[PDB]
Design a protein around this ligand. Structure first.
Ligand code: FDF
Length: 269
């Protein structure tokens, strides 16, 4: 029950998507370039971030690019948590300061994304987004340990929905009021966005997992509850005493960050 939306700048973003990974050594062969283009990652970013154009959308394209280039590095290493952690620690180190020039290319790529994500956002927003990233990397180490219901406790972090939502704020150049982000209602909405994404992904990944199909009814129930939660937002805004600008940022967060992450993956698949 959410509108499909796509950035008006999607064609330029898709045409230029290869320049960034090539300049950071993430794509070094023409076959790897073609394999990247066939995934439709700029198209996906233009649906997660329909409110972004120009360099803001380019940042979202790079994040999608980096996401699938990074997940690729775990199709034997992904079997041993010690080797997984050796790589995630080098990427996660970019959240704490400059990387050594010897860091692998996938790490310099993340650092370039993170450097652009933070500029112009409040320090508290950056600290909060940084811990979402650490949750994501820690989840990769947790699932590798499971290789050497309780599936959600790990998949909710490794699906990478929260950093995607985080970037929608940065791409829109707004911040949801931090006390509303921490609210029980907003957390429930974000939990639905995460659950819906990994459910649709485990359905699409059946050919190549939660099926190990009440999932379709589970998505419908969560989307119905998501609308219930959306209708609580006016009262939530008063409980936290939001002024006009804060109420407008919360509305921007509802439509351009949470709704887009729920709808965008569906229209992509
Ligand atoms: C919400 C996001 C994308 C939409 C849902 C998608 C494609 C999630 C990707 O799930 P994965 O199991 O890691 O790989 P797969 O495509 O299933 O072989 C951004 C995060 C993308 C990742 C790609 F791996 C997360 F690591």
């Amino acid at each position: 029950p959410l509108p499909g939306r796509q950035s008006p700048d999607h064609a330029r973003a898709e045409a230029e998507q290869l320049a960034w990974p090539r300049s950071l050594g993430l794509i070094r062969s023409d076959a790897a370039a073609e394999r990247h283009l066939r995934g439709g990652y700029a198209d996906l970013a233009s649906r997660f971030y329909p409110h972004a154009t120009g360099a803001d959308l380019d940042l979202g394209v790079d994040l999608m690019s980096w996401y699938f280039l990074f997940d690729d590095l775990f199709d034997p290493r992904g079997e041993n948590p010690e080797d997984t952690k050796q790589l995630t620690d080098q990427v996660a180190a970019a959240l704490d300061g400059p990387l050594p020039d010897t860091a692998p290319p996938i790490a310099h790529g993340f650092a370039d994304i993170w450097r652009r994500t933070c500029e112009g956002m409040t320090p508290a927003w950056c600290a909060r987004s940084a811990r979402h990233w650490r949750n994501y990397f820690d989840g990769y180490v947790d699932e590798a340990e499971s290789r050497f219901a309780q599936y959600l406790a790990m998949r909710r972090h490794t699906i990478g929905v929260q950093p995607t939502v985080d970037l929608a704020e940065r791409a829109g150049r707004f911040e949801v009021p931090h006390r509303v982000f921490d609210s029980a209602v907003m957390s429930a909405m974000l939990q639905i966005a995460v659950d819906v994404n990994l459910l649709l992904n485990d359905i699409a990944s059946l050919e190549k997992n939660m099926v190990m199909s009440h999932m379709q009814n589970e998505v419908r129930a969560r989307l119905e509850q998501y609308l219930l939660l959306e209708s609580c937002l006016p009262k939530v805004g008063e409980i936290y005493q939001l002024d006009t600008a804060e109420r407008e940022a919360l509305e921007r967060y509802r439509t351009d960050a949470v709704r887009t992450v729920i709808r965008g993956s569906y229209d992509w698949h």
